[PDB]
Write the structure tokens for this entry.
Amino acid sequence: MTELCPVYAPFFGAIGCASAIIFTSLGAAYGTAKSGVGICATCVLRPDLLFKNIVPVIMAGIIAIYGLVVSVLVCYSLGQKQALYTGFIQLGAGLSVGLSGLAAGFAIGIVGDAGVRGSSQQPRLFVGMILILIFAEVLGLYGLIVALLLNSRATQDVV
Amino acid sequence: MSSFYTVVGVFIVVSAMSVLFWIMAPKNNQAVWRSTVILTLAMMFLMWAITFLCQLHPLVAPRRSDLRPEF
Amino acid sequence: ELYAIAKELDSWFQDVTREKAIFEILNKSNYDTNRKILIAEGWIPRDELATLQARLGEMIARLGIDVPSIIQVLDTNHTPPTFHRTNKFTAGFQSICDCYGIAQYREINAGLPTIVTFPFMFAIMFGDMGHGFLMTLAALSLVLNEKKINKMKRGEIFDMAFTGRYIILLMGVFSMYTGFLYNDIFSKTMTIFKSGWKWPDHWKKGESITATSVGTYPIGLDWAWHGTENALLFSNSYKMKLSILMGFIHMTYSYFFSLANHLYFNSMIDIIGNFIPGLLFMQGIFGYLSVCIVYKWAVDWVKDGKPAPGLLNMLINMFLSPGTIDDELYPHQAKVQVFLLLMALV
Amino acid sequence: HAQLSSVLWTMTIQIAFGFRGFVGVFMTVALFAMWFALTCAVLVLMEGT
Amino acid sequence: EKEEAIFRSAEMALVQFYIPQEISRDSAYTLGQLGLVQFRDLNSKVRAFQRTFVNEIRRLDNVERQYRYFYSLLKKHDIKLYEGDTDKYLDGSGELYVPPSGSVIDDYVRNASYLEERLIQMEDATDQIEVQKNDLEQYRFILQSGD
Amino acid sequence: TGKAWCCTVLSAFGVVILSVIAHLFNTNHESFVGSINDPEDGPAVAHTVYLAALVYLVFFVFCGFQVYL
Amino acid sequence: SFSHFLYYLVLIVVIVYGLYKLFTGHGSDINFGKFLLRTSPYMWANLGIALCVGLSVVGAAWGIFITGSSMIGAGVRAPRITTKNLISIIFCEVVAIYGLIIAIVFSSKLTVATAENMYSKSNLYTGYSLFWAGITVGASNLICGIAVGITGATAAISDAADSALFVKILVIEIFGSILGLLGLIVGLLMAGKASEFQ
């Protein structure tokens, strides 16, 4: 165990690989669950909209995709003798993608539920929901991006 | 051997052809033709020039530790 | 009875809905009780006006009755309706822009500029020749079979996709162009041109090698930094600056559209007190930032022996610490920055 | 978009190049099917939208 | 030559029609066939029930209600509506077509009312027979149950 | 016919793509066999990808014939 | 409440431990100064950058759901508001972009320090500065987003009620949307004199 590379440095990166998927899958599950509740409430009256009110459940899954990407990138930078700086960077990259995806999912759900419930009455609202949902989704993206940037430094110029 | 003057010359050519099209834009849907073609030329050129200028005098060089020595 | 009704129900419905529709329209007219004429005020395109008259004349020729002037153009200060003559190409973008709102009468239409700028800003956000080509083929499937798809019935999502078929075609074409400039085809890069980077003559397996600039890639991002450790650092810098420059250019174009609107409506006060001040405020800060970005790109700092100034730290100090420049981008940078800050604050 | 595309390439079709023989051919076919499905779905419609 | 109205909105003109009453019904039909005049509400201060052509609109509303009952019956019994007349009026071409005569519209109203009464009584009789059949079938099922 | 259309599209997209990839591997393209982590042998990956492309070509021809009929 | 019971138990345990260390002459053994000096500044910096982005995103998302859910409900009868009140959703998503921006700027200072110059005055200062600047930006953007979303929901409902109302409520949003900006500015001032880890 080096000064710069303690034995516990891999702890943070492995918790970051986990945090990215666990929290982007919490947000995606919340979004999918609420959007599905809305879809089941609406499609009882309007089944024809079902294969088009699935969009929020598709966006929530994309949050989970953003943390399966940050997790897989952070897991391949994990090493037995990888620096504590790299471990902190990998923890930060998973904290960022995972938390941003949680927020984005929690919002995608609440907004998809509202928009599917209202679109069964006002079809023109579908465009409004998808636009409010693309801005809830971009939050998660912004986390991934930060996470990605973090990983671009995690292993580089590191002794 | 290319510099910012390459971007300037490409700009001159693009502006010349844009003016040429404006003069020779079809009468039918003339506004659509002029706007679409000239704006497309302008933004294509701008993106190309941005991509070319970043590579003119880059402050960071490609660095990798994975190439096979045979290359 | 129901089969007898069904064979003619649609015709009866269409005929009665039209009669109810003509009687609602006449309901908007002022029936002059003393006379026996309805006064109906209607907005019609001026170019269509002649046609209107002709058709009305035809009606008279059909009826055979002699009536006084049935058309009288009127000059009233009433907000006329906004009408944009579109086609199968511009209809999609016009709908895109109209969803936000209806343009003011004779105001600069945002669909004409969106025809190109909405696909190209998407392409910047997309930038892949593979995905761009797939989308181009998807749009071509609708475009080439546009007649057949128009004849048939379409679902809401499919109807939206088909209406914006030319939108998607342009998005795919510009995505192909941008991905070529990004050198990104299905996440891979093309090696059409000689790279501007030369890797060391010899190295051992696993040895960190850095390339030397021997030239500039003609079109697009050099494929030399594909799969390289620092590739992301160059891509991020380039694309941040590209986005900033493109957005500033697209906002300046829109602001000059506002100027054109002011000129057309003869609102000189808007030009003096609304357009010029905001233009100076936006230029002096963010157009100055864009010019600094381009100039820093155009300057060989390593060869010149001068540090590469941080444009973000330059902009931050342009406000928080005026007159304090860590690295001089150009001569008299401090004075120019102070002058621009004063211009914005005025 | 670039990072997700590269990541999809690594996860789906890059592995196929690691296997040879009949197993390699079958893996290439199935993995390209999955890669194209996710590219058209995720990277063309979803990211595209 | 019509101006291109993509850069800016098409120039608009307000026009007064001094439509004689004896041809008013026809004039509107031409103004609706052209599809180019956006009419202003000159009676915007007049209440809906106090407007001049309220009674004709009420008659047409009753006819459209009867037709919406006919469609409901055509959907209750699996009878397909015969679509048509899409090319009959050449909608969107700007060309005029002889509008239905006032006598034709009066005949439509009268036939709609007559069919309304006929279908109401026929549906009532059919529903009575159907409920009797359902009751008898339930009684038969009860009787057929095993001891 | 929808299944046939989807399969033939997915088969042409993959005939072309895997043929190009196999050609690049056989020519030992740097972007494909230029890294130590990339497969050591180029021509063999090219052969495997060519066989996969031939399988996709069989699928393409079969599904195109199905669409035709 | 289980949560309140846990809080009380933790407080009692902390008090008892502190009193035991203090009475036994080992009060200095609970040395927050040593904890700060010996904890890696990398941890502080990375926590700051992650919490900045995450909390800015959390407030953006929290506001987007509050504004978005009230726009959708109000647009059932007045869909005209859907696009008009979408500026509200841009005031909620702009705080996130501020956080992202700060992350980018602060990530530039995430360099690798040498072993000997690891817990120095400059490196510890950079760790504290990037932790607390990220905390400030993230929490300010959180508050600004949640507050701007609450104003945007009110604005959407008012716009549905009457169009003329919207422009008057948007002003309130413009008042709230500045609160993240201020945080952003303050963050840039905190990590202003911070340097890359060396």
